[PDB]
Symmetry: C3
């Protein structure tokens, strides 16, 4: 006729996604991305990190060098994987402050061991046990030297070794606690006092405790594992009258990106930075709900099973009408656009610049959230198999506090960002609407349903000029004014 | 007259509330709710949590079986409330890691004790002390067995108890430290000794220390309390030559929701999810400022004394003027509405759909904040009476860090939620204004004071349609245009 | 011309600052302020906190009374500064929980020492060492009494010291660990033994461990340092057969604002609340990147080297365009303003009320961020010279968690405040535009670039009336309608 209808609107999808916001908990959007990694590959990836498979060994067993760990001598790792099927198959032993030695070795990142010419004069070296079978013969820990009497004599040892290198030396040693007095006399030829291992900086004094223990692998005795770190310029001094499980040398202490993880997952052929006890995970998402123990460039752990970030706007599912009444399910070329009813027929076109502006802002948001990872290697233990008390309670409290704070941050971030995304895309729809209103000047009226009523004959070329920003309102001003106001 | 005025606006109150926002610290709102629970009932509510009243007992005193704790034997609790007037009136004891045992048992949640038939031979059982009286006779702890010599001999005990059940067993035992050597010879007929309690996984060795102590209840001697946890399939082996305060059995270890709290509040008939040492508190508010220690489904502790969440718009108290100039004290039916001037007279009506939309958004926000609590059962100690050093400093650092972070989160959350509340209620007022503008089309002009001047004769029927919606601008369009655009 | 052009706009600068927002991490603004203190003065200000310069003394050496530390006796501090050049010149010693004793003394805030009439009968007092030279004489720690023996006898000392005052008493004592049995007999006349120090509530029992150790200052023996806290109403019993490095009295324990810091910076004659190991820092900014170790009213430590807070608007660089197309680089009188073209000529003026409203809201934000810092005195150790185990790992984990969470909060806060500031100044431009539209009513049209076309004669008096809100649309309505329509 003499008028045309130009409706502005946006696309819609048949099946949207439900996201959370500040105003609402369940708002439907056209599209959303998962920000919580809730699955793993089931396998640990061996690249870029050097992964040392513990097999039947724990890290401490590999440190001491019991027979099943012979293949772990002088090895390095980025992450040591300890299996729950791992077991000791050697002399029974314990480590006072086990967790500290395990953390120290895990953070050292190597079992590189240099033998030293210790002056073990007057004692018999290389003691053996039936509990440690190396190659069908009795043996002992490969990195320890079980000293016993020589010719029924064990003289008081005072053996020193300067640290003349530029690095710290880690010495692993222990105390043998025999089952009975007959074993103390049989092995050391005398009752024992104390063993003192010292440096200039510090000293450790320990005592044997002769007495029966419940048998593990048919041995009623125990070895207690102790360690010392010797700084450059410092001197190790071992003062012992018996019951000394001597070092054969030193381990290297290194600073680095190494740690230890407990996992039953197989190790595959891969390239994945983030390792969890359930296997490696992608680190594209900013958060994860796989596990709380992590290694490498990992997402933050949260308790939410899902957090969906709106990478799109509110769906608003289902004459012509604009964005105020409904979204358009028939629009697939873009996010925002125009639909019109003209004397030449009905039609539709996408507005690609507003679509790209909204997409660019969403891409900015994703670039701020996606791809930014938390690269962490050595942390505290987060699952415990024994109840010790105050220290474990504090470690659990710290981890629970961290998880509650990061879960709060993730929930607030997702709700604020989703509210921002809806306000952003409604804002972009409004910028296109005000731009069209300003371009049309007095030649059209807002009908209140997201559409403009154009009061002049506006053909397809006219509509196209409006869509791409080249509409000249002066050409049609008299016709539209004469039609709006009955001159 | 030939024209009418329709002013849009919002309600106001004589006395508002001062809240914080992003750009304004002292912004007045019509209504706000307190988000910090800063008061308590002064009593601990005994439901739904099972609460065991310590009376004159500590949890440890109840654990060993102090004469004042006969009412605690084999009992369960969800929260043990330890009293500051509690004291021991039995043999004085020293638990070398008191906090760990107190926490371990508090989280275990029961004093269930099975009297296992320990094979004590060659010794005298059921030793008593004059400092621990039951029914006017000398007694001892009911869960400990003080072993002494029999016929002036104390043979070396070697007593084995395998763990043949499916749960862990907690054995509590100790070492007697007499005040002098005469006491040790009188009780044990041994100059000294060593006590070793072993499992397959770990061992504890303790030595008695003969010497004087300050007399507590006239006793110059001490009992050192130790505990062993025996896993299923593990074995308890006790080896002693003297000074053994023997176990009478085991306590059960359970994973659960139990804990210990220090408080002096009375216990009475009530119902409250969250327990605080100042008495139980309502858990409706998201935050609290009562005490650092909590139990159950509680709000999170912050340093803020008050944080008020706006549950209404900005209060701007003060011809007809609208939301641009002031708020309306005479609007009592709703939050948003209309006032009009026509030839019939002046009037006012509330717009209930905009009011309900704003209320629904606020109620959604309240559902996000109010009623959502965090269940916290066993945590670290958060108040200390003794100066311990590094571990206490770390616990204080962790708790103050948590509180500082949650106080920041509370301040940012309240400022963001109040800024959003103001923006949302101003947005709803602006949406009603734009909606009215759209219905009026060319039949009205914005007066710049929140009011529309309607340029057709408009008397109580057109105003009704405008308030309802679906106002027909076409019928009045020629009259309004003749009044607006004629010279 | 029968019309006039009235354009609205905002100022711009030739060179702006790059800030981060929620949806744009490289957005240029007219002005910004640094919220991360990234540099120190290099000196530790001696005011308002009382600071003791350790020089060659550690806190433990000051506690025990090392001969070089005589100047620290009975002194008080709000912050003790331990130097990396510090070393001992007395008997070698080992504190089995060094960090805990150092924390107790640092938090007590004083070395006020009170001598007590201990009954050290039957033994010789005031033992000396060649490693502790005080006045060119052999000496010992001034707060410890090295008891050896009297006439080749060491009767078992059973010494009681009641606490009859209202404060906790800190007693520092030790155990000598000689390098050989001959030294044990020479000093104490009898071998082995043990030392028990106890109160009503607690007890500590230790044993000497005779044996050679690596020589420090040509001495192969060690003194172990132990301590006990005696509450009011309690009694301290020291029971020793030998090897006792006895107390001479007690140290007072106070609750307060004292702590210890490791630093090599000199002490300056200045005033600053926040002290870091690199020296004092200003405490105006909400965050810092100088050090993790803090004392006083400090900002929070973050991982960011810089965080810039927009204190301005978008710097949109460039007949009259308006705010939608670009900013106005020629504006010096304000942030928001007007430009016009009329029958007399072109001109420009600032709108000071919109400018002040935007500035007042920005100052509100600055008042919430700047000047609000957090006073902390005694915290965990955050740097370590040796690796100890799970406790050090936990302390590092806790501090790193705090830093990551505050760094997250700092980035979220800066991005939200900068996005709000941009929305704020865009909103103020929009309220000024809408306000102008409302005064003009139907006498002007929005031409789409931030300008209004006014369809009536509007001289400089008219433009001024529009600027200050006195414009009356009724008097110009017939001319503007005749020119605007037909
Ligand atoms: C203390 O008791 C334990 C167990 O009751 C004894 O250990 C047992 O020794 C026998 C010796 O033939 C072994 O067959 C068992 O397997 C051992 N069991 C356990 C649990 O260790 C131990 O020998 C006893 N000690 C003394 C000195 O009599
Ligand atoms: C070591 O000295 C203490 C002094 O405290 C003696 O303990 C006091 O003994 C008397 C009499 O037995 C009591 O009246 C006091 O109450 C005790 N003191 C305290 C603080 O309780 C202790 O007897 C002495 N030891 C020896 C072996 O003589
Ligand atoms: C234990 O061995 C150490 C190491 O040789 C002895 O200490 C040395 O003693 C000589 C004696 O003049 C000194 O010159 C050295 O400087 C000492 N070296 C160190 C590292 O301390 C120590 O004397 C020996 N102890 C016994 C009892 O034989
Ligand atoms: C959602 O976005 C992703 C990534 O851009 C795209 O692959 C997917 O097809 C989108 N889905 C819908 C329904 O728009
Ligand atoms: C680990 O031990 C099991 C038996 O427990 C054995 O079958 C397996 O071969 C061992 N694996 C390696 C790598 O030695
Ligand atoms: C002990 O065994 C080690 C194995 O490396 C060997 O080098 C050393 O010579 C042996 N010493 C004695 C005394 O058998
Ligand atoms: C362990 O029991 C045996 C039994 O003969 C005894 O000789 C030994 O001294 C005991 N050890 C301890 C530490 O009690
Ligand atoms: C240390 O070695 C010396 C060497 O003479 C000896 O006399 C002393 O008994 C030893 N001490 C210990 C605890 O081994
Ligand atoms: C990962 O393993 C832990 C082991 O306790 C389990 O609780 C968790 O559900 C697992 N997660 C996934 C995604 O497999
Ligand atoms: C805009 O569209 C019209 C009609 O389709 C066309 O004539 C004109 O060249 C277009 N201009 C631009 C800049 O794309
Ligand atoms: C504030 O809201 C509460 C309901 O939560 C209502 O009871 C109270 O009357 C309101 N007060 C004002 C001043 O609006
Ligand atoms: C606790 O002590 C008070 C002291 O007055 C006494 O009345 C009460 O009976 C005691 N209760 C128990 C359980 O010992
Ligand atoms: C020791 O006392 C307990 C009390 O329960 C009793 O059952 C046990 O038979 C007594 N044993 C002896 C040897 O008196
Ligand atoms: C609750 O009790 C604690 C006890 O330390 C006290 O510090 C706090 O002020 C009390 N709070 C209230 C609200 O009574
Ligand atoms: C419109 O509002 C008026 C208010 O006076 C009311 O009387 C009338 O029933 C309403 N009509 C409809 C259709 O809502
Ligand atoms: C930025 O603001 C500061 C005051 O905070 C002022 O001194 C400085 O001149 C301003 N710079 C610019 C370019 O506006
Ligand atoms: C610190 O020690 C050095 C090296 O012995 C000495 O030169 C200096 O004078 C000492 N300073 C003080 C204050 O004791
Ligand atoms: C020991 O030295 C102190 C000075 O610190 C002195 O007061 C005391 O009288 C001396 N005692 C003896 C027994 O010489
Ligand atoms: C405790 O004091 C008495 C008092 O003579 C003494 O006999 C005993 O040996 C002392 N014990 C210790 C460990 O000092
Ligand atoms: C402060 O000192 C620490 C430790 O020496 C150093 O890592 C840091 O870079 C220093 N910072 C500044 C701003 O000097
Ligand atoms: C506004 O500006 C005009 C400029 O002509 C002046 O005459 C008038 O007095 C001013 N009014 C106010 C309130 O500043």
């Amino acid at each position: 006729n003499s008028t045309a209808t130009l409706c502005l609107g946006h696309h819609a999808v048949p099946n949207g996604t439900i996201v959370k916001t500040i105003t609402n908990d369940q708002i439907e959007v056209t599209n959303a991305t998962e920000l919580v990694q809730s699955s793993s590959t089931g396998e640990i990836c061996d690249s870029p990190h050097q992964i040392l498979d513990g097999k039947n060994c724990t890290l401490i067993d590999a440190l001491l060098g019991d027979p099943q760990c012979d293949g772990f001598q002088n090895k390095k790792w980025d992450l040591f994987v300890e299996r729950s099927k791992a077991y000791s198959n050697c002399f029974p032993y314990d480590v006072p402050d086990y967790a500290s030695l395990r953390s120290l070795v895990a953070s050292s990142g190597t079992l590189e061991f240099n033998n030293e010419s210790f002056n073990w004069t007057g004692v018999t070296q290389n003691g053996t046990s039936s509990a440690c079978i190396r190659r069908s013969k009795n043996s002992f820990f490969s990195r320890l030297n079980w000293l016993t009497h020589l010719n029924f004599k064990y003289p008081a040892l005072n053996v020193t070794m300067p640290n003349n290198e530029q690095f710290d030396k880690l010495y692993i040693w222990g105390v043998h606690h025999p089952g009975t007095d007959k074993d103390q006399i049989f092995l050391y030829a005398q009752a024992s006092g104390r063993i003192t291992v010292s440096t200039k900086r510090s000293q450790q004094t320990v005592s044997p405790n002769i007495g029966s223990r419940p048998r593990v692998r048919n041995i009623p005795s125990r070895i207690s594992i102790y360690w010392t770190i010797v700084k450059p310029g410092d001197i190790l001094l071992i003062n012992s009258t018996g019951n000394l499980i001597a070092p054969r040398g030193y381990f290297k202490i290194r600073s680095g990106k190494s740690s230890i993880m407990r996992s039953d997952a197989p190790i595959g052929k891969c390239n994945s930075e983030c390792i969890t006890p359930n296997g490696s995970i992608p680190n594209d998402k900013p958060f994860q709900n796989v596990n709380r123990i992590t290694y490498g460039a990992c997402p933050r752990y949260v308790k939410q099973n899902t957090l969906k970030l709106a990478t799109g706007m509110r769906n608003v599912p289902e004459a012509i009408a604009g964005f105020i009444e409904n979204g358009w399910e028939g629009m697939v070329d873009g996010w925002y656009g125009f639909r019109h009813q003209n004397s030449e027929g009905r039609g539709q076109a996408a507005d690609l610049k507003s679509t790209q502006a909204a997409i660019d802002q969403i891409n900015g948001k994703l670039n701020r959230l996606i791809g930014k990872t938390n690269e962490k290697f050595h942390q505290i233990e987060k699952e415990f198999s024994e109840v010790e008390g105050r220290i474990q309670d504090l470690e659990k409290y710290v981890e629970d506090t961290k998880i509650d704070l990061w879960s709060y941050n993730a929930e607030l971030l997702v709700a604020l960002e989703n509210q921002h995304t809806i306000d952003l895309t409604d804002s972009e729809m409004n910028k296109l609407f005000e731009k069209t209103k300003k371009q049309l000047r007095e030649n059209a009226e807002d009908m209140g349903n997201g559409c403009f009523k154009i009061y002049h004959k506006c053909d397809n070329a006219c509509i196209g000029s409006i869509r791409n920003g080249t509409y000249d309102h002066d050409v049609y001003r008299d016709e539209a004014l004469n039609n709006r106001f009955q001159i």
